[PDB]
RNA sequence: AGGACCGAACCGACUAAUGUUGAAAAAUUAGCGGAUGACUUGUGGCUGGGGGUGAAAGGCCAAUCAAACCGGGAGAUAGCU
RNA sequence: ACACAGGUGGUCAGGUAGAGAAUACCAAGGCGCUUGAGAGAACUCGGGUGAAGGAACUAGGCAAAAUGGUGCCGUAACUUC
RNA sequence: AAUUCCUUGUCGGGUAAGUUCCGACCUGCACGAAUGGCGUAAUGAUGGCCAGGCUGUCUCCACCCGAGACUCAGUGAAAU
RNA sequence: CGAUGUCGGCUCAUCACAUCCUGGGGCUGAAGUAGGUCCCAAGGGUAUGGCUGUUCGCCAUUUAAAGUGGUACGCGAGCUGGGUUUAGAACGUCGUGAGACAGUUCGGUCCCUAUCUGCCGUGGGCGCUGGAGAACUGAGGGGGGCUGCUCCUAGUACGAGAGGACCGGAGUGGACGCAUCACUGGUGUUCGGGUUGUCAUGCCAAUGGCACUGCCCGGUAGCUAAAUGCGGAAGAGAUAAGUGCUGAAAGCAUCUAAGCACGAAACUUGCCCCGAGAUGAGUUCUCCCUGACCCUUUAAGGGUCCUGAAGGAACGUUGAAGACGACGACGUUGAUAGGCCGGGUGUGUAAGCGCAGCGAUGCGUUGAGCUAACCGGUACUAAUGAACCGUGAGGCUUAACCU
């Protein structure tokens, strides 16, 4: 089953009549205009690429254009592409709204997340710090120890040390889907997706049901 | 936080492979004193996108 | 991590900024062109241009506020009467960044800075 | 929010004005006890004579925190105290017939349904 | 386990220095005298005699008396 | 932005009262026991109003049965049901934090008459 | 009145962090103890190496002390490297 | 050894607050410390604040926090008074 | 016990729990009377333990302000 | 021995199975519940505290369990320095004595800016055979895998009672991980107010400087956790111990030799991330270049005049991207940033004037004023006309094709 390129607008909530504040996130999906469908006989397997949102004359390239004044759509922002399942078909130039979610109830919204930089291994990957006082010397945040004497005379792969964190791609799975706004193209899942504001969001329905 | 080996003149060239300069691109000619200077910045005479900004 | 945040350090403690910006904004409504570094020019637009915002309504509460933000009165006369009818009808912008190349002691970006009804 | 090492008040009159939470019951490393979580204490003040006495270790259940619950909408319910019931050790059922001040809804369930019928306003 | 006292590096790493438990009667024995266990551990399981059997003979001392 | 601040807007209450800090405000909240709905009031100073529109909040300080007891009340929530000024306090402050401090005749706020 | 009390100059140097190719071949910063006494300090004098001096730690005697430094015996000696 | 955060005896001692030669801000005066410009990552140093708990840390309340002034009421064991 | 090896002696106090601590017992491995014994108010940058106050000490680290770190320009070391 | 720093702790670990729990079994002197023991199994998980420098240990209290070991009895160019290997001092003791003690006791400097391998990140170069913009297939590699209690089945089966299920389902917790800021909060030296000492603005008034942001009290965006969303799975393939079916060699018996079915948190997949430098360099879609000549040492050759494409780079305005490069948005045909305008939010009734008051002050003007990073707008200033790089139809050989 495919998914559909969202926008991530912000968080705010949806209050029931019980009293229980749903935390949602507004995605707003557009209407999402595939671009080239791919078969096993030409592409070696099934999917379709769709694209969303609008772009500038000058400022879409002229191999980016021709694109897609081969399948009949305006130029949207980006391309991303939905692998088929089996029974599902889709043309050249169909346009795709939010509708399909009207039925689900659960989603996996995959964004590319916030990006906090170069960043050490108390906050990448929860290391303790050392202890702050008692005599300690320069080493209240440092990682420690990252090895053996001699017999490993070598750091392990995939050790746990600093660098970057985030600005990755990550999903989250399973969101419960609030509210299916089909009327002002929206989208609201129980939870927190990743990436900022602004940001793309690659709402699927739920591999785990 | 020492060497064992002095290194070569082979890893220090190597080294210094990304240390060679990049020159400017190209200079933006004015359209009224028609010098060159560099793109965005104003002339060495005043001038920038033709006007006279500040005498000399 | 300075996501959203706004504001440049300039190596400086946040009390020096204050005082170099103000000692920045009386000098250039006082010559109406001054020569500074690309980025101590790029924050004094977001100090001089309000100074010349304040200077459009000629009151005592405003020219209590404006000698509050330089502490300076030949500033502050020449904000209202001379600067404030000046610019009396340009919504914002008041000042303009001239990028002059590099200055020959630090290899500084320099640009002058000036108000737009200079020359 | 009760870990260990924390003075708690005692909210009924089986005879204790100050007891110490020296462990959280319900799994392992678990740090925090919100309210309707079961503490084991030790009594460190005690009135002249009654049920319980200075240096005794039995179970107790938070009533009250000072980091408060949070109800399903959002909201927040803070007290100043942090204050629990003296339950038993074998039968963990409180002590004292008497609960003093307010205790909250998420602490009324069939297992302490002798509580929330004691205290006088169940917020 | 170890020694712990004076004595250096021998000491440091080295455990020469013996427990016994003796399980039903539960009297514990701890020698660290030495700096070998063999001359430690025959001197901790020759005191469960003198800890033991004169642990008995006193008890059938009170059902004497 | 746009799309969040209408949203709200289509949730919001409509007949929320002008309450400052330092109002014996009443609130009236629901309250679902068992099964069945009834209508708890819980009546103290207002020490906190914290605005955002749809997230608006009020916290309000009582003394109840000796213990204080404080109470962040989402203001547009649907558990709210009547938000009531019994009282008009006067303070020089816009969130009373100095009255946890104080009980008795030193939590006293004079009534604003204006 | 006081080898009295609190506390600056001044004299010290108890803890900590920094520093350890330092700013400094022992110091800076936040604290710290004495502060009319067996106190502290200026300027000169005096005691010399098996000797000085030492409220005594083998301390100190010119960044050197279980016997200074400089020259000399001297190219001591070295079954060791 | 340095245009070195060290060391160096005397003398003069203004204002307001203060018990004061403390300390804060100033006068006469003298300077901004002979590398600067950006950036606002880890991490280190020097600081500020902190939810709920408050020694659970640890070799040890190390370090931080805390206490801090004057007037008056009041002040225990012990005591060589 | 600045002394006790066995030893974390045993009993009592304090602790939810106390190899430390305090009070006693004496079976002093190996205290003892000016290489002084035992007391001792005051005093100590003295050693051990406890309690209130207090707090990033810690559960568990979060943020912010400055000096470095990083980048450009100038001068330009070192151990190995 | 021209130095291989040493016990315990802390911070990281990582492997082994002789497995502490969770999983699967056999046997039981296994009725049930709970066990006992043995085989299979390393996927995850595997206490906080009192005393001691302690490892060890006892104890308090948890836990599904608090595994045993390797790794220089891991880990000091990561940290601690209580202990122990120094110098001071004392006690007990031995010695006439200097001194001595696996006897004790108080005090006692822990250095190094990373060249290389290693590892975590992030780029530059060229390669992939004309060049270019994108979209991917996934060989490979990593991450994740823990689980309690309660309820239903059922007080059923079992049992004489006491008690009390397997199998299966539904909830809701701990621990951990990831994302996030809507909420509750923290910070918020860039916002607003209170206030102390002083100083300055000619003075009163009003304000600013400095004193840790002077000391405070609130607080926007941001980042954050204690805050709240989600996650571990289901299934599938082939299995381990184990249980089988049919079944001979061996007329019986037999799970195995031919044949066949079952079987666990392990294994291969399923789930998330990276990923064609996967040189075995792949695939698909799109775009762009259709000029003339010389020369000889004839070949995948140098050179010349014209030409300079798609595109990329640079520069600039910059970013919820960021150490620097990178990545992303924007460049007048334009909301990329600042300003401006309206709003929001925060502080909590500015200044000036008037009045009440002997005055401090109070009140009306007044929810006033100011209001950072936020939200919605607006071209007001800065984002330049160019130029620079890339070229001009893409080798050879066979094959199916082609008219
Ligand atoms: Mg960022
Ligand atoms: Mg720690
Ligand atoms: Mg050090
Ligand atoms: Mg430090
Ligand atoms: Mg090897
Ligand atoms: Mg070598
Ligand atoms: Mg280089
Ligand atoms: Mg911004
Ligand atoms: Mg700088
Ligand atoms: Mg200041
Ligand atoms: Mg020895
Ligand atoms: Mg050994
Ligand atoms: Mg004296
Ligand atoms: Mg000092
Ligand atoms: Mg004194
Ligand atoms: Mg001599
Ligand atoms: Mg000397
Ligand atoms: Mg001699
Ligand atoms: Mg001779
Ligand atoms: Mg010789
Ligand atoms: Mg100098
Ligand atoms: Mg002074
Ligand atoms: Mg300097
Ligand atoms: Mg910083
Ligand atoms: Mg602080
Ligand atoms: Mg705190
Ligand atoms: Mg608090
Ligand atoms: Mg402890
Ligand atoms: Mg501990
Ligand atoms: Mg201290
Ligand atoms: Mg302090
Ligand atoms: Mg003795
Ligand atoms: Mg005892
Ligand atoms: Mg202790
Ligand atoms: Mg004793
Ligand atoms: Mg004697
Ligand atoms: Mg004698
Ligand atoms: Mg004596
Ligand atoms: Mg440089
Ligand atoms: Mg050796
Ligand atoms: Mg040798
Ligand atoms: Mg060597
Ligand atoms: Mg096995
Ligand atoms: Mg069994
Ligand atoms: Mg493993
Ligand atoms: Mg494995
Ligand atoms: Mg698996
Ligand atoms: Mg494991
Ligand atoms: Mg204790
Ligand atoms: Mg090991
Ligand atoms: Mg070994
Ligand atoms: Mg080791
Ligand atoms: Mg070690
Ligand atoms: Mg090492
Ligand atoms: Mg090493
Ligand atoms: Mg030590
Ligand atoms: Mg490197
Ligand atoms: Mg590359
Ligand atoms: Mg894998
Ligand atoms: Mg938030
Ligand atoms: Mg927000
Ligand atoms: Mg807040
Ligand atoms: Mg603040
Ligand atoms: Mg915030
Ligand atoms: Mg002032
Ligand atoms: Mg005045
Ligand atoms: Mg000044
Ligand atoms: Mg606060
Ligand atoms: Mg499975
Ligand atoms: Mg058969
Ligand atoms: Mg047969
Ligand atoms: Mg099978
Ligand atoms: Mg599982
Ligand atoms: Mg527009
Ligand atoms: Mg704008
Ligand atoms: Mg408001
Ligand atoms: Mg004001
Ligand atoms: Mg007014
Ligand atoms: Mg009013
Ligand atoms: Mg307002
Ligand atoms: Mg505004
Ligand atoms: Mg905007």
Not at chain 1, 99 to 105: Q, S, T, Y
Not at chain 4, 11 to 16: E, I, K, P, T, V
């Given at each position: 089953m495919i998914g559909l390129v969202g926008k991530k607008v912000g968080m705010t909530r949806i209050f029931t009549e019980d009293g229980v504040s749903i935390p949602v996130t507004v995605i707003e999906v557009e209407a999402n205009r595939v671009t080239q469908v791919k078969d096993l006989a030409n592409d070696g397997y099934r999917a379709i690429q769709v694209t969303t949102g609008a772009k500038k004359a000058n400022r879409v390239t002229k191999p980016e254009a021709g694109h897609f004044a081969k399948a009949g759509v305006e130029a949207g922002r980006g391309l991303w592409e939905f692998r088929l399942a089996e029974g599902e078909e889709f043309t050249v130039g169909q346009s795709i709204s939010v509708?399909?979610?009207?039925?689900?109830?659960k989603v996996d919204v995959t964004g590319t997340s916030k990006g906090k930089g170069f960043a050490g291994t108390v906050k990448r990957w929860n290391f303790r710090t050392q202890d702050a006082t008692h005599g300690n010397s320069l080493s209240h945040r440092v990682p420690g120890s990252i090895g053996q004497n001699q017999t490993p005379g070598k750091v392990f792969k995939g050790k746990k040390m600093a660098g970057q964190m985030g600005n990755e791609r990550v999903t989250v799975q399973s969101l419960d889907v609030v509210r299916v706004d089909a009327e002002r193209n929206l989208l609201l899942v129980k939870g927190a997706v990743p990436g900022a504001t602004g940001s793309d969001l690659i709402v699927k329905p739920a591999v785990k049901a | 936080a020492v060497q064992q080996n002095k290194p070569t003149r082979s890893k220090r060239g190597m080294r210094r492979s990304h240390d060679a300069l990049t020159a400017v691109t190209s200079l933006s000619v004015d359209k009224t004193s028609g010098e060159k200077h560099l793109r965005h910045h104003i002339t060495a005479?005043?001038?920038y996108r033709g006007r006279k900004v500040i005498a000399k | 991590m300075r996501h959203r945040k706004s504001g440049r350090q300039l190596n400086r403690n946040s009390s020096h900024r204050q005082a170099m910006f103000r000692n920045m904004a009386g000098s250039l409504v006082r010559h109406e062109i001054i020569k500074t570094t690309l980025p101590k020019a790029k924050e004094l637009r977001r100090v001089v241009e309000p100074l010349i915002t304040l200077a459009k309504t000629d009151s005592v509460a405003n020219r209590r506020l404006a000698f509050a933000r330089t502490r300076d009165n030949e500033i502050v006369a020449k904000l209202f009467n001379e600067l404030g009818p000046r610019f009396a009808?340009?919504?914002?912008?008041?000042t303009r960044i001239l990028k002059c190349g590099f200055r020959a002691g630090d290899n500084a970006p320099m640009a002058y800075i000036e108000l737009v009804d200079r020359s | 929010m009760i870990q260990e090492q924390t003075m708690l008040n005692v909210?009924?009159?089986?005879?204790?004005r100050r007891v110490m939470c020296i462990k959280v019951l319900g799994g392992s490393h678990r740090r925090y006890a919100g309210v309707g979580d079961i503490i084991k204490i030790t009594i460190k003040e005690a009135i002249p004579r009654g049920k319980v006495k200075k240096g005794d270790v039995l179970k107790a259940v938070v009533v009250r925190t000072k980091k408060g619950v949070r109800r399903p909408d959002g909201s927040v319910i803070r007290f100043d105290g942090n204050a629990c019931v003296l339950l038993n050790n074998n039968s963990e059922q409180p002590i004292g017939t008497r609960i003093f001040g307010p205790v909250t809804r998420e602490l009324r369930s069939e297992k302490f349904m002798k509580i929330i019928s004691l205290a006088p306003e169940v917020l | 386990f170890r020694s712990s006292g004076a004595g250096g590096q021998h000491v440091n790493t080295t455990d020469s220095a013996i427990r016994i438990t003796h399980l039903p009667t539960g009297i514990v024995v701890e020698c660290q005298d030495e700096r070998s266990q063999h001359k430690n551990k025959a001197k901790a399981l020759s005191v469960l005699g003198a800890r033991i059997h004169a642990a008995e003979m006193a008890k059938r001392q009170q059902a004497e008396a | 932005s746009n799309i969040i601040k209408q949203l709200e807007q289509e949730q919001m209450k409509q007949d929320v009262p002008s309450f400052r800090p330092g109002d014996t405000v009443e609130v009236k909240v629901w309250v679902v026991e068992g099964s069945k709905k009834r209508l708890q009031a819980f009546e103290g100073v207002v020490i906190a109003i914290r605005n955002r529109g749809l997230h608006s909040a009020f916290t309000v300080r009582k003394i109840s049965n000796g213990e204080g007891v404080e109470r962040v009340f989402?203001?547009?929530?649907?558990?709210?049901?009547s938000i009531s000024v019994k009282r008009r306090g006067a303070v020089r402050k816009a969130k009373l934090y100095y009255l946890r401090e104080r009980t008795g005749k030193a939590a006293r706020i004079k009534e604003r008459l204006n």
């Open positions: 509708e399909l979610f009207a039925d689900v109830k | 005479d005043g001038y | 009808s340009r919504a914002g912008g008041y | 909210a009924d009159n089986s005879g204790a | - | 989402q203001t547009h929530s649907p558990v709210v049901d």
